[PDB]
């Protein structure tokens, strides 16, 4: 079972338009978020995701979905993202259930019994008022693999107000990626 | 001879789209508005060089260079990416009207470290020569992320006829495991 919450875009689509050799435009749109109820050692929580996204957040704090795009970086270039535009809307989650977003759990240690792993829940973070989230865009050089320099372009469309149980979703995100060199 | 000849392709813009339906599957589309043809002076004579915006040169070393597009994708744990071609458009473009020079041969790497490589047998091959339209290669893992390279090969070349066969508006489905 899952609740589908419709967002202000007709489709979940990512586009890249190559406008020159050292520049491209990209656009990210999301038609919905999927909210699933998850049973845990700390209670029932909600888990919100977007198609092709991965969960992010500090260990013990509410998990939110982010999208990652991998790009090839030319030799001697630095990728620089410029945000052109986006839309933004708030979505109240209490109407679907009073459960808060699930807390982000630590990575699993291979030799551990999953049943005996202590559940991490930062009560102080769950009592903090106002919207919490990452910068909309991030660029990180990951390294070189088989002669290809790879960067990770991360898009963080979701902010969350745990006390109000509200999502703030940025959508129709238009960016320009420039490969700065000299 | 820096300014390229712009050959109009059968798509209004150079654009890549990814329509993410599920966590196990996404659709992608690749389109190209034009090919750029430049004349290049080399150790082995003057040759033509064809490119597409956002593409990189490919081909066997010593054989005609053709542009390909590479998309890097994150692969879920335990999954194998599998590509299915849904559709594409195709058109042939005669290059002799721009010049009789053939496409330049693909060089190994790159001042004088790398000698000039020219496979005369590759330049006598009749008919269209090129790679499969799509290829998937696991590159490895970097900072907890499994990375695959999805290569799209829109160009085939008939060196004797000096003609390009360009596949465009390429629609694919990528499924994980």
Key features?
four-stranded antiparallel β-sheet, 182 residues, five-stranded antiparallel β-sheet, homodimer
The helix-strand sequence of chain A is EEEEEEEEEEEE
Strand content of chain A: over 45%
Query: How is the main sheet of chain A built?
Result: 5 strands, antiparallel
Distance between the termini of chain A: 53 Å
Total number of strands of chain A:
12
Shape of chain A: globular
Quaternary state of the chains = homodimer
Q: Gyration radius of chain A, to the nearest Å?
A: 18 Å
Number of helices of chain A: 0
Q: Quickly count the domains of chain A.
A: 1
Determine the fraction of residues in helical runs of chain A and give it as a percent range. under 10%
Largest interface: A-B, 25 and 25 residues
* Secondary-structure class of chain A: mainly beta
PDB class: hydrolase
Keywords: Cysteine protease, zymogenic latency, hydrolase
Assembly: dimeric
Entry title: Structural insight into zymogenic latency of gingipain K from Porphyromonas gingivalis.
Describe the structure.
2 copies of one chain form a homodimer. The termini of chain A are far apart. The relative contact order of chain A is 0.28. In chain A, strand 9 (137-145) and strand 10 (148-155) form a beta hairpin. Chain A has 182 residues and is mainly β. In chain A, the strands form 3 sheets. In chain A, strands 2, 3, 8, 11 and 12 form a 5-stranded antiparallel beta sheet that branches. In chain A, strands 6-7-10-9 form a 4-stranded antiparallel beta sheet, with no helix packed on it. A 3-stranded antiparallel beta sheet of chain A has the order 1-4-5, with no helix packed on it. Chain A has strands at 3-6, 13-20, 23-29, 32-40, 43-49, 54-56, 64-73, 78-92, 137-145, 148-155, 158-161, 166-180. Chain A has one domain (1-182). The interface between A and B is medium-sized, with 25 and 25 residues.
């Amino acid at each position: 079972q899952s609740a589908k919450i419709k967002l202000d875009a007709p489709t979940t689509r990512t586009t890249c338009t190559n406008n020159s050799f050292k520049q491209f435009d990209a656009s990210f749109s999301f038609n919905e978020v999927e909210l699933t109820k998850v049973e845990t050692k700390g209670g029932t929580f909600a888990s919100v995701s977007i198609p092709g996204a991965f969960p992010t957040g500090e260990v013990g704090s509410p998990e939110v979905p982010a999208v990652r795009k991998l790009i090839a970086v030319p030799v001697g270039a630095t990728p620089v993202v410029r945000v052109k535009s986006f839309t933004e809307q708030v979505y109240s989650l209490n109407q679907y259930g009073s459960e808060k977003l699930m807390p982000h759990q630590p990575s699993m240690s291979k030799s551990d019994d999953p049943e005996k792993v202590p559940f991490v829940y930062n009560a102080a973070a769950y009592a903090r008022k106002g919207f919490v989230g990452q910068e909309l865009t991030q660029v990180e050089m990951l390294g070189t693999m088989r002669g290809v320099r790879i960067a990770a372009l991360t898009i963080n469309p979701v902010q969350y107000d745990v006390v109000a149980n509200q999502l703030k979703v940025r959508n129709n995100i238009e960016i320009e990626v420039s490969f700065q060199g000299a």
